[PDB]
Amino acid sequence: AAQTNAPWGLARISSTSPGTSTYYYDESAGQGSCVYVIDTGIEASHPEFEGRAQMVKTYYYSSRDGNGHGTHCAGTVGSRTYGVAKKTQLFGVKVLDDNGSGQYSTIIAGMDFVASDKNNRNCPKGVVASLSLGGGYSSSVNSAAARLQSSGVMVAVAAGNNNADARNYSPASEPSVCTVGASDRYDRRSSFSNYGSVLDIFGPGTSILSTWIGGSTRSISGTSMATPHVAGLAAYLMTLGKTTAASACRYIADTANKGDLSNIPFGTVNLLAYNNYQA
Ligand SMILES: [Ca+2]
Ligand SMILES: [Ca+2]
C-alpha cells in the first residue's frame, strides 16, 4: 500500500533516503494492535481517527483534549492521513491537563493503569504505549515505565527537547524502554533533541503535521512528535508478526537506517526508524 504526498515523517520511515513523499506500508496497517497514548487526551471524534480512537482514563475533570498535543500524537500513531499504523486501535490516557503539564504521581498512576487495562481490551497482535512527555530524573517514574514494559507493553518514550544528555530525564533515562530522539527532514538531528547512550532510535520530530483539536490539523516539533512515529511503527511491526512487545525496540534498532543522521554526538546511536517494507 502507498500513500502519496504523505507527511515527510511518514515518507521517511518507509525510505532509505531523505527527500521522498510516498509512505509505503503493508495494508495490514497495525490491524489487531493497540496503542495507549499517555498524553493530554485524544479528540476521539476527529474524522481522521475513523472511530478507532477512544478515551479510556482521565485524571482530570474531563476526558476532553483541551490542549491538542495528545490528539497530535494519537494522529501520528494511527490517523488515516498522518498515522504510521493506519488501522490500529488508539486508547487515550489523559495524564496531563489542558496546559500540557502534570504531576509525576499522576503520570505514574497513568502508567500503572495501562499495565492493567490492557487485560480488558482485545489486542491480539500486542499493546504499545506512546509517552510523549518528560521532566527531570525520577527513579519512581523510571521504575513505573519499567513496570509498564515488563507487563508486556512496548513503551516508547520521548528523549526530551533540552539539547542535553537524556540520562538526566525521566522516563527517558529508563534503559528498559524505547527512548526516541528527533530528526528533521534533512536527516539532521533535531536541534532540540536530547542525545546520549540511553537513546535507542531516532524518528521524524521536526515539523510533523498531524491531527489537532476541533477536527483540524497543524504541524509542530519536538521529540514528543518522533515518539508516536516509533510507537506506531512498533504496532505496525507487531501486527505483521515480525516482533513482540518485549523485543520491538531492539528489533526497530536492528532494522533501522544506520548512519544516515548528521549532528549525532559520539556515543549516541545513529539509527533512524525504518519499516523496511518491500512492495
Ligand atoms: Ca540512506
Ligand atoms: Ca532502551
UniProtKB/Swiss-Prot annotation:
The active site is at D39 (charge relay system), H69 (charge relay system), S224 (charge relay system). It catalyses: Hydrolysis of keratin, and of other proteins with subtilisin-like specificity. Hydrolyzes peptide amides. Residues 7-279 form the Peptidase S8 domain. Binds 2 calcium ions per subunit. Keywords: Calcium, Disulfide bond, Hydrolase, Metal-binding, Protease, Serine protease, Signal, Zymogen. Its cofactor is Ca(2+). Ca(2+) 1 binds at P175, V177, D200. Belongs to the peptidase S8 family. Hydrolyzes keratin at aromatic and hydrophobic residues. This is Proteinase K.
